[PDB]
Structure formats: structure tokens, C-alpha cells
Amino acid sequence: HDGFQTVKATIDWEHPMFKLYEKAKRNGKWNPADIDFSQDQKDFASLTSEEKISALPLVAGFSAGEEAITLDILPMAHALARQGRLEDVLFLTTFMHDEAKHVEMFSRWQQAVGIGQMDLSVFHNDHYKRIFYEALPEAMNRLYADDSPEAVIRAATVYNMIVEGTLAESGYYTFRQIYKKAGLFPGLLQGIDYLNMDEGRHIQFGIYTIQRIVNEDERYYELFIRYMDELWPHVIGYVDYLTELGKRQQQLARTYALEIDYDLLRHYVIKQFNLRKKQISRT
Amino acid sequence: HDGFQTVKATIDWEHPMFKLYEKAKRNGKWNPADIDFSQDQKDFASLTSEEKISALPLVAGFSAGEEAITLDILPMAHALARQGRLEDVLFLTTFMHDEAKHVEMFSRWQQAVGIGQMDLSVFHNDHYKRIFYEALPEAMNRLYADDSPEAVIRAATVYNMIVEGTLAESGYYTFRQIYKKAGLFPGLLQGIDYLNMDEGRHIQFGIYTIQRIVNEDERYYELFIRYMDELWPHVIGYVDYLTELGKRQQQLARTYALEIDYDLLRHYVIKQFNLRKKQISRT
Ligand SMILES: CCCCCCCCCCCCCCCC(=O)O
Ligand SMILES: CCCCCCCCCCCCCCCC(=O)O
Ligand SMILES: [Fe+3]
Ligand SMILES: [Fe+3]
Ligand SMILES: [Mn+2]
Ligand SMILES: [Mn+2]
Ligand SMILES: [Mn+3]
Ligand SMILES: [Mn+3]
Questions:
Q1: Of B33, B94, B132, which Cα lies nearest the Cα of A26?
Q2: Which end of chain B is least crowded, N or C, by CB within 10 Å?
């Protein structure tokens, strides 16, 4: 270290990421350990085997995603720390702790309903793996040796704009469209509501990061759009795979009179993807 | 990634670091933004210039240390993440967020009392710089390329056993011995109480980390002792420098009838150092 900002000066109290950090502390008190999952255990046990499975693809996607994101944010925190972006780092401590609670929430649900011993990796197809097993850690880990604006934009695009701003947001919507209607899994849905609220700050950090780089040179806008489009095939290829699992196993939909509109879910994904694009201004 | 623990299985709910993570969430709700510093501003302004300075060396040491530690824990989190130690990572998200709040607390105090514009690096002598500007980032950053048991023990020794378990603990004691007696700076002392409570978990993570490595091969015990002793000269060399500043500027002690026992503070430092050693068992 050559010096310390809070010895030479203070935190930059007006910095957007300090304000986001402050909001994260105010809004981040929830604890997955307090969620009552006992009704969820009864719901899951009440289900037939073919209804039991209906929910597992989505939980498998979230549980791996939360865990990937918990591990893979560390290089972003490092890169920004090394750039002396102290307020970003303070905020990223809330981001990382949020994702830890997200991992915890889904794992507590799996334990409570009796599937913790079940290996849910069978529900990760090639497109999911390309995003979460490969493209996400590649883009983040790159920041250890290459913290160029190109690398940081690509990292924020994959992590915050695609994984969180497209897939996670759409998954929260899907959970609600399906189980909130069914009256099922109230503990899980309480957790989803807290995850979704945290996610708002995570996406805003991505937007801030990408926009501040675009702000220095509008040609980075083109890079942002390009990286969004490179991942789209895998995003929809996973969505299509989940859709086809749902269409092939309809008993939960039948039993609970959910006219599950998979083409409305698909449209919600397309819509999320397009509005994330629109939250980055070329100028 | 080759897979995900919370897809194949669950969190290891009995893991000591998951239990420490759970305690951190329960005990880590405090927010520096809620501390009332208005009485602290009046106290500081009431002081003469020569009393004003008396407190600044210690705040300078803490503010830089909190900031160093916030940046320099990231490689430990990374190394353990890459080892698949998921429960350690979950706990480290609380550790990192705690230190962010510590940075925030001291910087809020500096702002409130009117010294935020003052560059307090003048109170970092060569021994302080050797620990915080050099040895700490060197030991932590090494973990990016070398996560051997030797490297991890050395990192935990410098960070958790020396910086936190010797210097920080002794600084908390010193703040209380001096200002809690004077009736001064109630907001700062509220913050110190919260820092000290957080620190308990940070030191326990260090103990767990060092002991689990020693447990695999008792020869690492010798390394631990050696790394403790290598840093001791700098620890006491900074303590002696602070002591001599205090002896050379006594007006706060006089004004507030603090018979400040600098040789009792020195003994407290020696005692902390020796009991950290004793918390690691050769077997
Ligand atoms: C059937 C419609 C498809 C809806 C899309 C569902 C997407 C599943 C979500 C899995 C990825 C979750 C990523 C977590 C991100 C974070 O924790 O910030
Ligand atoms: C006059 C007696 C000397 C007492 C020793 C005072 C030591 C000052 C403390 C500065 C280091 C603080 C390190 C912070 C560690 C953490 O935040 O985990
Ligand atoms: Fe997120
Ligand atoms: Fe600490
Ligand atoms: Mn395909
Ligand atoms: Mn010396
Ligand atoms: Mn999440
Ligand atoms: Mn601290």
C-alpha cells in the first residue's frame, strides 16, 4: 500500500456506491435462518413424485448460480480494490454477503424439504454450464490479470446484466407465477422476495460499473451490446430446456390449476434482456 | 467450476465456520451510520490543540488498519474458495463486511469531529508501515499464487493473530483505558465496543485456520511461532513509538486526571501476543 484514503481524507460520502452500500445495510438485515420452512416440508411431502420433480430444475439452477456468484465476485472486488475504488469495495462487501445468504437460503430449503441428499446437477444442460461453469468464472477471474475497461465491462455484463439482470430476475418471476399461485412453499417464496430485493442493488452496481466505463468512451457501449448478444444463445437455450422439462412434466400444473404460460415466461426473459440493454446509455 | 456443493449436497451445517457465520449474522446488525457523534464533535472542539492531537495517533493507526484489512482479506477468501471451503467463504463474507463497517466507523468519527481533511499518515512510523503497508499485503497477496499450508498459516498469523489479535485488541483496550475514563468521545467508544465484538469472530477464524493446518502436521506449529516472533519487533516498535508520542504530549492526560499507565498498556500488548500463541496447540 502507498497510503490509505481514510487516513489522508475520508470516505467519499457522496459516491453512488457508498449510497448503495448504505442502502444495503439498511435493507439487508434478513436472515435465512429465521425463515420457517416447516410448511414447505409438508407441501413437498404432500406432492407426488412427478410433482416433486417439477420444482427441482429451477432450484438446481438457482443453487448453483448463487454458489458460483459467491465465489466468482471476489476478483471484481479485488480489481476495484487495486484501483483504489474504496466505496465500490465497501458496497461489494454487502453484495458478497448477500450472495452467501442466497446460497444459504436455497440450501436450507433443500435440507428442509428432504432433497439435500439429491444431486440436482442433472438439471444443468450444456447451455447452463456454458454460462455458470465456464463463462462466468472466466470473465471474473480474468480481472486478476487484466482489469482493462474491456475486461470490467465484460465481467459486469456476464455477472450483473445476464446472470442477475436476466436469468435471476426471470427466475424470481417464474417462482411467483408458479408457486405463489399454487399456495405452495411459503418459506421459499419469502426467501425469493428477499433475494429479489437484494438483487436490485446487485444490478445497480452492474449498471453503475458499465455506465462509468461507457462514460469515458462511448465505443465501450458497442462492446457491452456485443457481450450481451454473445450470451443470449445460452440464456435462451437454458430457458428452452427448462420450458421443455416443464412441458414434459405437467402434473404439478394440472394438480394446482396453474395455466403455466411458458411463452409468457419466455417473453419475460426476452423482455428482461432487452431492458438491461436499455439501462446503459451510449452517451 | 466442476460442480457446486449446494447442488450435489448442502452446506455442511456442522462446520465450525458455518456456525461462526451464523453467529456473525446474529451479532452483526450494528450500523455505524446510527451512531450519534454529536457529543464527540463537542468534546473534540472543547479540547485544546495539544489535547486534540493526543487521540489522533491511535485513530490514524486504526483507520489505516481497517482499510488495509478490508482490501487485503480478499486473497484469503479467494484461496479458500478455490479450495472448495464453502463454509469458510460464507463466514468470510461477514468478516469482510465487518471490516467495511470498521473503516466506515472511524471515517465517520473523523468527519464528525472535524479532522477528515487532516492527513493522519504522519503518525505511521517505519514499524507501522512495515506491518500494514508491506507485510500484511505481501502475506495475503501471496495466496493468489501460493496457497500452501505455509502461506495460509503465515497469512492468518500476520492478519488475524498479530494485526487483529495483538494490535487491534490492545488498541481497543487503550481506547477504553484512556477515553472511557475521561468521559470523552461516547460515539467513538460505542463503535469500539462493536468493533471489539466483531473482532472476536475474526480472531476465531484465524485460530481455526492455523489450528486446522497444524492439525495435519505438527511441524507447522513451529512455523506459526516463528512468524509471530518475526513480527514482534515491529509490533513493539510501533507500540514504543505511540508510547513516546503519548509521553511527549501529556496535556490530555493532565487535563482529565488520567494516570495513563503506558507500561501497563505495553504489558497488555505483550500479554495479548503471548496468549495468541497459547491459543494454537502443537497437537
Ligand atoms: C421456465 C422459464 C425460465 C426462467 C428462467 C429461470 C432462470 C433460473 C435462474 C438460475 C440462475 C440464478 C443466478 C443467481 C444470481 C445471483 O444470485 O445474483
Ligand atoms: C499506547 C499503547 C499501544 C496500543 C496499541 C495500539 C494499536 C493501534 C491499532 C492499530 C491497528 C488496527 C488494526 C485493525 C484490525 C481489524 O480491523 O481487524
Ligand atoms: Fe445477486
Ligand atoms: Fe478484524
Ligand atoms: Mn442447444
Ligand atoms: Mn525502530
Ligand atoms: Mn443471489
Ligand atoms: Mn476491524
A1: B33
A2: C
Residue to substitute in B54, B56, B59, B62 for testing ligand 2 pocket (most ligand atoms within 8 angstroms of CB): B62
Distance A56 CA to ligand 3 centre (A): 20
* A120 Cβ contact partners less than 8 Å away, ≥ 6 residues apart: A56, A59, A60, A63, A110, B7, B8
A86 with B94: Cβ contact below 8 A: no
Q: H or E stretch including B119?
A: none
* B90, B121, B134: residue with CB nearest A104: B90
Chain A residues with beta carbon closer than 8 angstroms to that of B82: 71
Q: How was this structure obtained?
A: X-ray
Name which of A74, A110, A133, A144 to mutate to probe chain B: the one with the most chain B Cβ atoms within 10 A of its Cβ: A74
The domain locations on chain A are 1-283
Given A25, A33, A74, which is nearest B81 (Cβ)? A74
Contact B100 A89 (CB under 8 A): yes
Q: Is B234 exposed, middle or buried (0-12, 13-18, 19+ CB in 10 A)?
A: buried
Amino acid type, B104: E
Q: Which helix (H) or strand (E) holds B160?
A: none
Minimum-distance CB partner of B9 among A66, A103, A116: A116
3-state secondary structure chain A: CCCCHHHHCCCCCCCHHHHHHHHHHHHCCCCHHHCCCHHHHHHHHHCCHHHHHHHHHHHHHHHHHHHHHHHHCHHHHHHHHHCCCHHHHHHHHHHHHHHHHHHHHHHHHHHHHCCCCCCHHHHCCHHHHHHHHHHHHHHHHHHHCCCCHHHHHHHHHHHHHHHHHHHHHHHHHHHHHHHHHHCCCHHHHHHHHHHHHHHHHHHHHHHHHHHHHHHHCCHHHHHHHHHHHHHHHHHHHHHHHHHHHHHHCCHHHHHCCCCCCHHHHHHHHHHHHHHHHHCCCCC
Residue nearest to atom 17 of ligand 1 (CA): A66
- CATH of region B1-283: 1.10.620.20
Place of cell 439501462: A279
